[PDB]
Design a protein around this nucleic acid. Structure first.
Ligand code: FES
Ligand SMILES: [K+]
Ligand SMILES: [K+]
Ligand SMILES: [Mg+2]
Ligand SMILES: [Mg+2]
Ligand SMILES: [Mg+2]
Ligand SMILES: [Mg+2]
Ligand SMILES: [Mg+2]
Ligand SMILES: [Zn+2]
Lengths: 291, 190, 52, 164, 232, 50, 77, 109, 115
RNA sequence: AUAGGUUUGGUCCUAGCCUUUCUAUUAGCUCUUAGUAAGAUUACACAUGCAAGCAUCCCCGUUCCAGUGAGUUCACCCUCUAAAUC
């Protein structure tokens, strides 16, 4: 079947394409500061500490799962017409039993008409935040997510901040989460700011979105210009496996394209700007020969 | 009357501001007057009472061209620690309590508008499992009464008592009776 | 019948535990005999007015 | 400065640094050790450094010490069932003794995490009450709800003075 | 501008030192009065000078006229300069506990933005030196001259990270909570690296101060500690 | 603890005096039909019984 | 509130609590509704009591609890 | 559930034997000084039933809680003598010893 | 504390401020003060509509069931709240009051028609 | 405590007292509005009016709530086991 985002193979290629820069991953945070500690270590001990930091970064860079938009909840439990007109405002009942997953937690609404129905997704999230507050999440939607403030955030090249705020505020399968993430990805593609997301956990999701929407040209060009040729070839391979019935896949199979030939075949078959891909690849090869 | 009221940030890029303050914060040269070596733990409520300035106005009140606005990000940055991102308490800079509250509100508004950079942490997911198959969020099978349109229990509806029982009640409560009530309206009267 | 929310919770628990039965949850009231309020109570357990 | 050699032993951080939480069976721990003799060195250190930590993590276990009563050091644990556990500690370092006692009679990390999760349930985040027990005092502290009249006066229509 | 108090000479600036007979100018140096005393009459002044970039000193001047004492003290101070090593040019390299005569000075290295929470004379001397973040507590007799001497001695006898690396022949690696588990190597020996590690001291035999432990455990309750103050 | 013996004596004496001065049914449940009140206590009966 | 030793107010000695009048049909319907509601609530209460007792029994002599006890004893040995 | 006595198993030194079939035992526990954060010994006296009167002053004994107190102050019984005074047997090797010296060598057996 | 007789009951303890009520659903001894000692807090109830026009009710259903199975009684407002939630059948008085309101509004509409 | 003033003809040391900070009560002088919280000094004496009824009679409740701080290691944990709810 078609690979899922969480498959071992796709996860491995996305992890290798993301990269791991310890300086960017553990950049100094602006927060309450304490006096630093110091240790005397040998070369072996320093290497041990470096590998432990690499493991910590690997844990930090764990990609969030990519989920499909949740179906709206429209379910009625009861219709007690006797209660119609006896109340002016709806009652929201939340079951706050502690040891229950929040997606298995019963939340219901008794409307003024007497209808006992299941709470909508937005109401469910609001109630869960009210009674089980999560750090970083606000009961009322923050104004930063309005598209004007989002343009401002993008203009300041703070896309990672926007994605972190989105992850803190919205559930992965919510409409707002998907919309904000897609808008950020669109801005990144339109302004060639892919390097902002490298060495972060959102790069895999961005690459997945670009591949699924067949708009990997800009990312491929950026990778070629940054001499990450292996990443570009792996991106072409991921495009082929995600679209095995596409012209690029059959072209690579027919011409037996490996390595750079895969990129050339993709540029000739299914590239919206294949000419610039060819130009950049030729420039990269010429520079490689000169070096 | 300040010509920078509509666009406060302009004042911070003017040559008058550079001459007055240079590169140091607007509060750098201010000093509170008080008794003792330990100052009071709060600043004065306000430097302006009934449109009259006090003898030693704070850094904000001493310059009428300095406007506390969420768009004047450069001014607001001077009252936030660049190394920890925390707003200085009022005694730190000597700003009066009113101006300190206004500065805090403006800084929060600028941060909420994406105009002021602040540390946003990376948080973990709320739930460990994202399945939406449970009945709490899925569709519960309708009960037979719901399908048939009947009330959940038969006694939710009014059933007219037999005449014999009504006569028995009338005998039981001789002289202490109201008018008998018939079946209620089927729907809520509009 | 069970109350609406309790019925829904019972059905959800059954579906979570793998049970796919379509039988409605039902409350047995055969063991609940509603005795008329005017039935004689136990006079042996009743108290007595104290002398004052 | 702080009195005595190794004053760090008399700080709550060091006392809490111990990793030995005895099972409920243990009631008494006797420590027979010798003040002199190289082979007992670790035992002496075990008395000097780790007995305070063990007692701190096990306040109800009776720990008693005995000096120069036997040719070799040893530990004896008395259990509630009446069983006795003898641990020879001659030639062993203090860290080795700690690891051995933790292995044979110490609660594993799984039980400790289970206990911590059990403690977590007592403080329900949804409950409202004094800050000593609850995150929030009133629902008025929740955004979107009607705020406290102390900070924001209620509309005249919602006040009994102007409803009467 | 007033000094530490309205009627106090301490903390008042005397301007740059005069050009010396050697022919050297000192326009980048600032002078601050630390003490003025009547000698029974003449005037004895203790002053400190510094350029704000690690070079600082202090001197005593005695004269019948106060201005002559100021000039003498300043001119002698510029010729007895210390150099003070600064970690990242804002703080000290490590905590320093010293006792000069009966005056005890405990100084603590602090992160950026912490400010100067120190005795007012220590604040002035730090500003002259260029130290921007440090904590200091003075105990015993508060004698200005002894305080200055002990401060300068302790600040001049601090070991830098490079010196420690050369002495131990090992990498000095800094761990910052804000930077996560990233190891930041701040100093490496100029010579070869020793291959055997430092002994993993299970419990070091360090001399702890009861005030620091009490503060860490929360048993310190002083109404005067951690009070809000103006920027220093 | 300093014993409280007077309490013991009082409880025993009250128990004995309540067991020996029991009001009888003829006294407790007599009724004055003109006012419909209990002469023993003076409390009037509920209206619905009159 | 008053204790049993406090005298009754002199303004209430002649107080007669007149019972409220009765609407026969509503009275009968309400009586039946109360009977049915109390029956249902008693059934729910018995089921909740049974669940509580079952949980106590499963905590003390449950099969999982006994397996855990045996495992702990074997580990100790 | 097995006893109403708080202290179930305790180890102490016998300090008195003048009562018939009853040993007065001194039990030491470690109590943390709240200010100094140092552990000091806190002493408590217990009366233990000694049916055979085999306890001598100075020996280290183990006491087990009685199911119920047999007297006002007797809530325990002598389970065993851990160390007989001057007649200690090394638990590790099982050989008699006088202080830190073996009276009978372990190798002899 | 030992009370003469009594029983556990799940009820509403009133908190908040003047003209701003709020309720804590608590299982407590019936003889204890309304806002005094309780055995366990079983939920909350905000009777004032919020910015979304909703009255928020939180119910610890597991603990409510546990305490009902332990012999705890219920105050009438709690029976009405649980009936509204659908946890219990609708209390008879809610139905009766709804019918009374229906008849009263029918009388008002008939008055309007007569005029 | 980031400390400061004060002993001597003068220096250093030791040592007390006081100053600077934050609360609460009372007193002087002064005092515009709105919301909220809190509110005899006295276990001294109390005019007056209320603070416990319900209910087909029996019972039940008035042993609760509310008040005070005189006295003062009856409050907490374990064992056992009355009364009470289911
Ligand atoms: S404390 Fe919540 S309304 Fe006042
Ligand atoms: K009654
Ligand atoms: K008292
Ligand atoms: Mg002055
Ligand atoms: Mg003094
Ligand atoms: Mg003098
Ligand atoms: Mg006043
Ligand atoms: Mg019983
Ligand atoms: Zn001001």
């Amino acid at each position: 079947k078609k690979p899922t985002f969480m498959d071992e193979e796709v996860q491995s290629i996305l992890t290798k394409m993301t990269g791991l820069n310890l300086q960017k991953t553990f950049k100094p945070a602006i927060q309450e500061l304490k006096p630093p500690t110091y240790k005397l270590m040998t070369q072996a001990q320093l290497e041990e500490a470096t590998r432990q930091a690499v493991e910590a970064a690997k844990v930090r860079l764990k990609m969030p799962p990519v989920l499909e938009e949740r179906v709206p909840i429209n379910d009625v439990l009861a219709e007690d017409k006797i209660l119609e007109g006896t109340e002016t405002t709806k009652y929201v009942f939340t079951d706050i039993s502690y040891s229950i997953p929040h997606r298995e937690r019963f939340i219901v609404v008794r409307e003024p008409s007497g209808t006992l129905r299941k709470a909508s997704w937005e109401e469910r999230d609001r109630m869960i935040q009210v009674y089980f507050p999560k750090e970083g999440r606000k009961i009322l939607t923050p104004i930063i997510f309005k598209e004007e403030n989002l343009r401002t955030m993008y203009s300041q090249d703070r896309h990672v901040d926007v994605l972190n705020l989105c992850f803190a505020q919205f559930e992965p399968d919510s409409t707002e989460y998907i919309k904000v993430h897609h808008k950020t990805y669109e801005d990144i593609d339109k302004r060639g700011k892919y390097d902002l997301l490298r060495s972060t956990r959102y790069f895999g999701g961005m690459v997945w979105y670009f591949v699924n929407n067949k708009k990997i040209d800009g990312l491929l060009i950026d990778q070629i210009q940054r001499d990450l040729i292996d990443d570009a070839t792996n991106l072409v391979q991921l495009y082929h496996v995600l679209h095995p019935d596409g012209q690029s896949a059959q072209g690579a199979k027919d011409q037996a394209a490996e390595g750079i030939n895969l990129i050339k075949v993709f540029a000739k078959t299914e590239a919206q700007k294949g000419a610039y891909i060819e130009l950049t690849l030729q420039t990269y090869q010429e520079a490689l020969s000169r070096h | 009357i300040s010509p920078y009221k509509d666009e406060p940030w302009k004042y911070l890029e003017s040559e008058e501001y550079q001459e007055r303050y240079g590169s140091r914060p607007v509060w750098a040269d201010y000093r509170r007057n008080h008794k003792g070596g330990v100052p009071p733990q709060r600043t004065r409520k306000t430097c302006i009472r009934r449109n009259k300035v006090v003898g030693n106005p704070c850094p904000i009140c001493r310059d009428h061209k300095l406007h506390v606005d969420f768009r004047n990000v450069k001014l607001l940055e001077q009252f936030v620690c660049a190394h920890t991102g925390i707003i200085f308490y009022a005694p730190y800079t000597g700003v009066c309590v009113k101006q300190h509250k206004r500065l805090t509100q403006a800084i929060q508004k600028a941060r909420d508008h994406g105009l002021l950079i602040y540390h946003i942490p990376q948080v973990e997911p709320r739930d460990l499992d994202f399945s939406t198959s449970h009945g709490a969020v899925s569709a519960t099978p309708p009960a037979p009464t719901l399908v048939s349109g009947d009330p959940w229990y038969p006694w939710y509806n009014w059933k007219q008592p037999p005449e014999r029982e009504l006569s028995r009640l009338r005998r039981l409560y001789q002289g202490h009776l109201q008018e008998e009530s018939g079946p209620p309206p089927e729907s809520m009267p509009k | 019948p069970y109350p609406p929310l309790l019925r829904a919770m019972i059905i959800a628990e059954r579906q979570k535990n793998g049970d796919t039965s379509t039988e409605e949850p039902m409350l047995n009231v055969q063991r609940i005999r509603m005795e008329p309020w005017d039935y004689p109570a136990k006079q042996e357990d009743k108290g007595r007015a104290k002398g004052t | 400065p702080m009195k005595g050699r190794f004053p760090i032993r008399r700080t709550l951080q060091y006392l809490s640094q111990g990793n030995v939480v005895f099972k409920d069976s243990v009631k008494v721990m006797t420590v027979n050790y010798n003040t002199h003799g190289e082979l007992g060195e670790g035992a002496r250190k075990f008395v000097f450094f780790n007995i305070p930590q063990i007692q701190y993590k096990n306040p109800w276990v009776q720990i008693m010490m005995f000096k120069n009563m036997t040719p070799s050091p040893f530990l004896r644990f008395y259990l509630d069932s009446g069983e006795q556990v003898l641990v020879d500690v001659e030639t062993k370092s203090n860290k080795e003794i700690m690891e051995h006692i933790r292995k044979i009679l110490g609660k594993n990390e799984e039980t400790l995490r289970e206990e911590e999760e059990e403690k977590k349930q007592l403080s329900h985040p949804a409950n409202f009450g004094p800050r000593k027990y609850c995150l929030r005092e009133c629902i008025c502290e929740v955004e979107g709800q009607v705020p406290c009249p102390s900070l924001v006066p209620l509309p005249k229509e919602m006040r009994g003075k102007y409803k009467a | 501008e007033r000094g530490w108090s309205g009627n106090s000479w301490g903390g008042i600036s005397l301007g740059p030192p005069d050009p010396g007979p050697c022919g050297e100018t000192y326009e980048d140096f600032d002078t601050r009065i630390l003490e003025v005393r009547n000698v029974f009459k003449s005037i004895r002044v203790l002053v400190a000078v510094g350029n704000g970039k690690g070079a600082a000193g202090f001197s005593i001047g005695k004269a019948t006229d106060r201005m002559d004492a100021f000039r003498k003290a300043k001119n002698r101070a510029v010729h007895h300069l210390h150099y003070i090593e600064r970690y990242e040019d804002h703080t000290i390299f490590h905590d320093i506990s010293l006792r000069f005569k009966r005056t005890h000075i405990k100084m603590k290295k602090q992160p950026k933005g912490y400010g100067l929470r120190c005795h007012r004379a220590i604040i002035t001397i730090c500003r002259l030196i260029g130290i921007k973040d440090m904590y200091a507590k003075v105990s015993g007799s508060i004698n200005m001259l002894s305080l200055t001497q002990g401060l300068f001695r302790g600040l001049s006898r601090q070991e830098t990270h490079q010196q420690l690396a050369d002495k131990k022949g090992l990498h000095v690696v800094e761990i910052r909570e804000e930077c996560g588990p990233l190891p930041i190597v701040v100093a490496s020996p100029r010579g070869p690296l020793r291959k055997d590690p430092e002994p993993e001291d299970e419990v070091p035999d360090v001399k702890l101060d009861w005030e620091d432990v009490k503060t860490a455990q929360g048993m310190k309750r002083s109404v005067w500690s951690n009070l809000k103050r103006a920027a220093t | 603890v300093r014993p409280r013996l007077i309490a013991e004596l009082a409880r025993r004496v009250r128990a004995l005096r309540e067991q020996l001065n029991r009001p009888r049914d003829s006294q407790l449940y007599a009724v004055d039909y003109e006012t419909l009140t209990r002469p023993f206590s003076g409390r009037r009966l509920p209206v619905r019984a009159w | 509130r008053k204790t049993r030793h406090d005298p009754l107010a002199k303004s209430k000695i002649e107080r007669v609590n007149m019972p409220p009048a009765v609407d026969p049909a509503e009275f009968f319907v309400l009586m039946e509704r109360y009977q049915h509601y109390r029956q249902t609530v008693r059934a729910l209460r018995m089921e909740f009591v049974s669940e509580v007792q079952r949980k106590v029994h499963e905590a003390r002599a449950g099969v999982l609890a006994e397996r855990k006890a045996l495992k702990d004893a074997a580990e100790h040995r | 559930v097995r006893s109403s006595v708080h202290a179930r198993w305790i180890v102490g030194k016998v300090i008195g034997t003048k009562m018939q079939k009853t040993a007065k035992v001194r039990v030491t526990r470690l109590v943390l000084d709240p200010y100094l954060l140092k552990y000091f010994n806190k002493r408590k006296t217990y009366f233990a039933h000694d049916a055979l009167q085999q306890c001598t002053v100075g020996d280290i004994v183990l006491l087990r809680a009685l199911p119920v107190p047999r007297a006002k102050h007797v809530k325990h019984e002598l389970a065993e003598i851990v160390f007989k005074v001057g007649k200690v047997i090394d638990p590790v090797t099982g050989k008699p010893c006088a202080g830190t010296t073996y009276l009978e060598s372990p190798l002899s057996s | 504390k030992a009370y003469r007789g009594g029983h556990l009951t799940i009820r509403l303890a009133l908190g908040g401020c003047t003209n701003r009520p709020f309720y804590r659903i608590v299982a407590a001894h019936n003889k204890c003060p309304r806002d005094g000692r309780f055995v366990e807090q079983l939920g909350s109830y905000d009777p004032l509509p919020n910015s979304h026009g909703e009255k928020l009710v939180a119910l610890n259903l597991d603990r409510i069931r546990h305490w009902i199975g332990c012999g705890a009684h219920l105050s009438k407002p709690m029976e009405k709240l649980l009936g509204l939630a659908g946890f219990f059948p609708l209390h008879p008085m809610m139905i009766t009051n709804a019918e009374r309101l229906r008849r009263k509004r029918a009388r008002e509409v008939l008055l309007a028609s007569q005029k």
